[PDB]
Amino acid sequence: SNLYTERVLSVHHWNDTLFSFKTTRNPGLRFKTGQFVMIGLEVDGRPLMRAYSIASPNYEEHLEFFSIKVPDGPLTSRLQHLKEGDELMVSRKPTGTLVHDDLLPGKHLYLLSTGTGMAPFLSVIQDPETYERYEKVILVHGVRWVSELAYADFITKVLPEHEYFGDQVKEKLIYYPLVTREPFRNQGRQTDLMRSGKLFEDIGLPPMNPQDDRAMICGSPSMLEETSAVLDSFGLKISPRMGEPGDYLIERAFVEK
Ligand SMILES: Cc1cc2nc3c(=O)[nH]c(=O)nc-3n(C[C@H](O)[C@H](O)[C@H](O)COP(=O)(O)OP(=O)(O)OC[C@H]3O[C@@H](n4cnc5c(N)ncnc54)[C@H](O)[C@@H]3O)c2cc1C
């Protein structure tokens, strides 16, 4: 059918509610950094499909997904059991609002995420175009528990040594993990820390302004609303719709069903 059937190459569990996996990628699946695609499994005679951000670089011939594990979630109660060699259905045309083209030129790119909302941003931080367009890239990953800080080693130790753009990562990428419920070097919610100015002080950058700062926001619908309001308070204006460049972009990491 119009769905690709890919094969699982590797799986890694981060904790009780998070895991990632890599699959083969059909050469016909083209995507812009930041986009999502429908993926799923055949259940009771029908594909059980859900939107997933593509977490792998768009120039590499494989796909990677960073996923939640919902106890009785229709798709993830099954997806959590993926093993090497298993089949995964993937749709043909990715889409989404978190693309480079919809941000006006600027100096800093803030990637504001909570939970699995960091997924599209994993693609962004591995995209040479990101470093071509910005002086600084700030990946904020807000979670509740330290164990939810998936990809910590990749972001802080592996990516900076990248053979082709590791030096750009060292010079430009700032990683600001945040944890609310356990002791952690950076405590709190990113929205609160931005409103007080503490987030910027911690990372060594000036407060945001509409001329220099751009952002992509990915988290729960409530998180998007609250974070959008914070950026609006600094004078930034959201892209009004896909295709119309603005100061920041937003996309729901999931929906409360
Ligand atoms: C544009 C878009 C991109 C998405 N990208 C991803 C992604 O990269 N990774 C991913 O894991 N999910 C992502 N999601 C959510 C995903 O589509 C499914 O909701 C997820 O795979 C759970 O399916 P389910 O069938 O198990 O549970 P569902 O019935 O879908 O959802 C059950 C409940 O789980 C919670 N839930 C679902 N997904 C999440 C989540 N990711 N984090 C926290 N709580 C959640 C909610 O309380 C929800 O009501 C995305 C959603 C959208 C709209």
XYZ file of C-alpha atoms and ligand atoms in Angstrom:
310
model
C 0.000 0.000 0.000
C 0.979 3.673 0.065
C 2.831 2.883 3.252
C 6.482 1.940 3.434
C 7.329 -1.090 5.525
C 10.704 -0.484 7.164
C 12.815 -2.750 9.351
C 14.089 -2.056 12.887
C 17.871 -1.841 13.106
C 18.388 -1.076 16.792
C 16.463 -0.222 19.978
C 17.470 1.551 23.198
C 15.363 2.074 26.317
C 16.078 5.231 28.304
C 13.780 4.520 31.248
C 10.293 3.221 32.127
C 8.478 5.685 29.842
C 11.004 6.453 27.087
C 12.821 4.557 24.336
C 14.306 5.145 20.889
C 14.808 3.012 17.820
C 16.330 3.185 14.360
C 14.900 1.718 11.154
C 15.777 1.457 7.507
C 14.699 4.399 5.293
C 13.286 4.114 1.781
C 15.077 6.525 -0.570
C 11.704 7.903 -1.602
C 11.055 9.273 1.892
C 12.358 12.822 1.670
C 11.942 15.283 4.520
C 12.859 18.740 5.748
C 14.554 18.871 9.152
C 11.909 19.112 11.859
C 9.077 17.343 10.073
C 7.021 14.404 11.299
C 5.583 11.361 9.574
C 2.921 8.804 10.444
C 4.327 5.492 11.730
C 2.675 2.397 13.129
C 1.893 -1.296 13.320
C -0.701 -3.622 11.825
C -3.286 -4.408 14.495
C -6.475 -6.436 14.053
C -6.489 -5.913 10.277
C -5.654 -2.198 10.145
C -2.528 -0.084 10.509
C -2.546 1.680 13.901
C -0.786 4.920 12.992
C 0.472 7.904 14.973
C 2.359 11.104 14.153
C 6.067 10.913 15.065
C 8.792 13.515 14.604
C 11.802 12.201 12.673
C 14.756 12.388 15.077
C 17.474 11.377 12.594
C 19.435 13.733 10.223
C 17.731 14.112 6.840
C 20.920 13.255 4.926
C 21.377 9.830 6.566
C 19.827 6.690 5.107
C 17.978 5.468 8.180
C 15.226 6.799 10.441
C 15.295 7.306 14.195
C 12.359 7.869 16.524
C 12.289 8.973 20.195
C 9.145 7.589 21.800
C 6.946 7.704 24.866
C 5.701 4.402 26.381
C 2.058 4.850 27.484
C 0.887 1.846 29.616
C -2.349 1.210 27.749
C -1.584 3.414 24.755
C -2.937 1.694 21.622
C 0.275 2.095 19.653
C 2.978 2.361 22.291
C 1.768 -0.511 24.477
C 2.908 -2.545 21.431
C 5.693 -0.316 20.052
C 7.599 -0.564 23.337
C 8.282 -4.224 22.451
C 10.066 -3.520 19.141
C 13.082 -5.725 18.460
C 15.719 -5.826 15.755
C 14.173 -7.039 12.532
C 10.588 -6.053 13.335
C 8.453 -4.287 10.733
C 7.288 -0.689 11.090
C 4.889 1.042 8.713
C 5.827 4.593 7.729
C 3.791 7.024 5.624
C 5.103 8.609 2.417
C 4.905 12.368 2.877
C 6.267 14.087 5.979
C 4.909 17.469 6.995
C 5.011 19.897 9.903
C 5.662 23.443 11.108
C 9.125 23.125 12.661
C 11.133 23.899 9.527
C 14.068 26.256 8.967
C 12.381 28.077 6.114
C 9.648 29.503 8.323
C 12.002 31.410 10.617
C 13.144 34.907 9.649
C 16.955 35.384 9.634
C 18.366 35.780 13.145
C 21.339 35.179 15.450
C 20.160 32.645 18.004
C 17.937 29.597 17.687
C 16.186 28.470 20.879
C 14.848 24.899 20.739
C 12.337 24.855 23.577
C 11.165 21.339 24.387
C 9.657 19.173 27.104
C 9.707 15.377 27.149
C 9.603 13.686 23.752
C 9.184 17.144 22.216
C 12.977 17.133 21.932
C 12.618 14.594 19.086
C 12.464 16.986 16.092
C 15.248 18.998 17.665
C 17.578 15.994 17.630
C 17.334 16.283 13.843
C 17.862 20.069 14.037
C 21.098 19.796 16.046
C 22.517 17.321 13.517
C 21.657 19.529 10.534
C 24.548 21.521 9.026
C 22.008 24.124 7.873
C 21.245 24.900 11.502
C 24.848 25.997 12.108
C 24.991 27.854 8.813
C 22.064 30.034 9.928
C 22.854 30.817 13.568
C 25.572 32.050 15.879
C 24.181 30.046 18.826
C 21.745 27.119 19.068
C 20.214 26.517 22.489
C 18.626 23.154 23.167
C 16.417 23.350 26.249
C 15.066 19.994 27.396
C 12.627 20.250 30.270
C 11.653 17.104 32.122
C 10.383 15.956 35.525
C 12.972 13.302 36.419
C 16.679 13.021 35.671
C 16.151 9.651 33.953
C 14.022 11.415 31.323
C 17.079 13.312 30.021
C 17.446 10.997 27.030
C 20.405 11.454 24.669
C 22.485 13.235 27.305
C 25.699 11.432 26.350
C 25.033 11.800 22.640
C 24.470 15.541 22.951
C 27.328 16.335 25.312
C 29.991 13.821 24.293
C 29.355 12.285 20.883
C 27.919 15.099 18.740
C 30.719 17.574 19.657
C 33.223 15.125 18.138
C 31.332 14.834 14.856
C 33.857 14.384 12.054
C 32.338 17.098 9.853
C 30.593 19.679 12.061
C 31.748 18.834 15.569
C 33.643 22.098 15.777
C 30.453 23.996 14.899
C 28.699 22.061 17.674
C 31.432 22.921 20.190
C 31.304 26.608 19.261
C 27.557 27.025 18.912
C 25.478 24.375 20.672
C 24.333 25.069 24.220
C 22.530 22.233 26.022
C 20.316 23.281 28.913
C 18.593 20.286 30.494
C 16.018 21.123 33.210
C 14.503 18.867 35.879
C 11.658 19.742 38.243
C 11.188 16.884 40.737
C 14.692 15.696 41.724
C 18.006 17.410 42.539
C 19.631 18.619 39.328
C 22.133 21.222 38.256
C 19.405 23.216 36.476
C 16.127 23.108 38.401
C 12.750 24.332 37.282
C 10.460 25.045 34.351
C 11.881 26.789 31.303
C 8.987 29.251 31.080
C 9.528 30.467 34.640
C 13.305 30.716 34.074
C 12.820 32.720 30.911
C 10.330 35.117 32.523
C 12.790 35.810 35.376
C 15.752 36.054 33.007
C 17.609 33.289 34.850
C 17.723 30.935 31.845
C 19.653 33.480 29.779
C 21.991 34.323 32.663
C 22.727 30.601 33.172
C 23.643 30.047 29.524
C 25.555 33.289 29.113
C 23.406 34.992 26.481
C 21.474 38.256 26.551
C 17.724 38.506 27.056
C 15.714 37.737 23.945
C 14.644 40.418 21.477
C 12.633 40.153 18.221
C 15.532 41.143 16.024
C 18.070 38.523 17.117
C 16.205 35.590 18.589
C 14.263 32.798 16.953
C 12.699 29.723 18.453
C 10.966 26.446 17.827
C 8.678 25.179 20.621
C 7.625 21.534 20.982
C 5.766 20.160 24.001
C 2.256 19.547 25.319
C -0.519 21.873 24.158
C -0.450 23.609 27.573
C 3.329 24.004 27.332
C 2.989 25.565 23.857
C 0.465 28.096 25.116
C 2.537 29.081 28.138
C 5.862 29.241 26.282
C 4.335 31.158 23.357
C 3.065 33.744 25.826
C 6.569 34.136 27.268
C 8.093 34.717 23.841
C 5.283 37.135 23.004
C 6.176 39.101 26.150
C 9.633 39.748 24.679
C 8.103 41.036 21.462
C 8.536 37.981 19.253
C 5.817 37.231 16.712
C 4.835 33.696 15.751
C 4.754 32.500 12.136
C 1.036 32.904 11.367
C 0.850 29.632 9.445
C 3.098 27.188 7.616
C 4.845 28.974 4.761
C 4.802 32.425 6.402
C 8.158 33.179 8.142
C 8.085 34.507 11.680
C 10.173 34.770 14.848
C 9.119 31.435 16.281
C 7.322 28.202 15.406
C 5.335 25.735 17.461
C 4.148 22.129 17.176
C 2.377 19.873 19.660
C 4.543 17.031 20.965
C 1.303 15.124 21.605
C -2.390 15.666 22.295
C -4.417 14.842 25.395
C -6.894 12.319 24.077
C 2.852 16.453 15.296
C 2.987 15.357 16.317
C 4.266 14.772 16.531
C 4.452 13.753 17.484
N 5.722 13.222 17.683
C 5.943 12.252 18.645
C 7.229 11.744 18.871
O 8.210 12.120 18.206
N 7.378 10.811 19.876
C 6.317 10.335 20.676
O 6.524 9.536 21.546
N 5.053 10.814 20.432
C 4.869 11.747 19.453
N 3.579 12.214 19.265
C 2.415 11.506 19.891
C 2.058 10.209 19.162
O 1.372 10.600 17.968
C 1.169 9.247 19.921
O 0.243 10.006 20.706
C 2.119 8.293 20.748
O 2.869 7.579 19.925
C 1.220 7.539 21.835
O 0.212 6.638 21.079
P -0.551 5.754 21.819
O -1.316 5.215 20.750
O 0.219 4.873 22.530
O -1.363 6.597 22.941
P -2.444 7.722 22.575
O -3.839 7.316 22.632
O -2.062 8.433 21.487
O -2.139 8.840 23.645
C -2.530 8.386 25.104
C -2.195 9.474 26.113
O -0.722 9.482 26.219
C -0.270 10.864 26.545
N 0.729 10.859 25.367
C 0.818 10.477 24.029
N 1.964 10.733 23.485
C 2.709 11.314 24.468
C 4.049 11.807 24.465
N 4.832 11.754 23.385
N 4.548 12.359 25.644
C 3.749 12.424 26.791
N 2.451 11.964 26.850
C 1.967 11.417 25.678
C -1.506 11.684 26.641
O -1.910 11.841 27.961
C -2.520 10.950 25.788
O -3.840 11.342 25.973
C 3.314 13.255 18.286
C 2.029 13.834 18.064
C 1.858 14.871 17.103
C 0.472 15.441 16.946
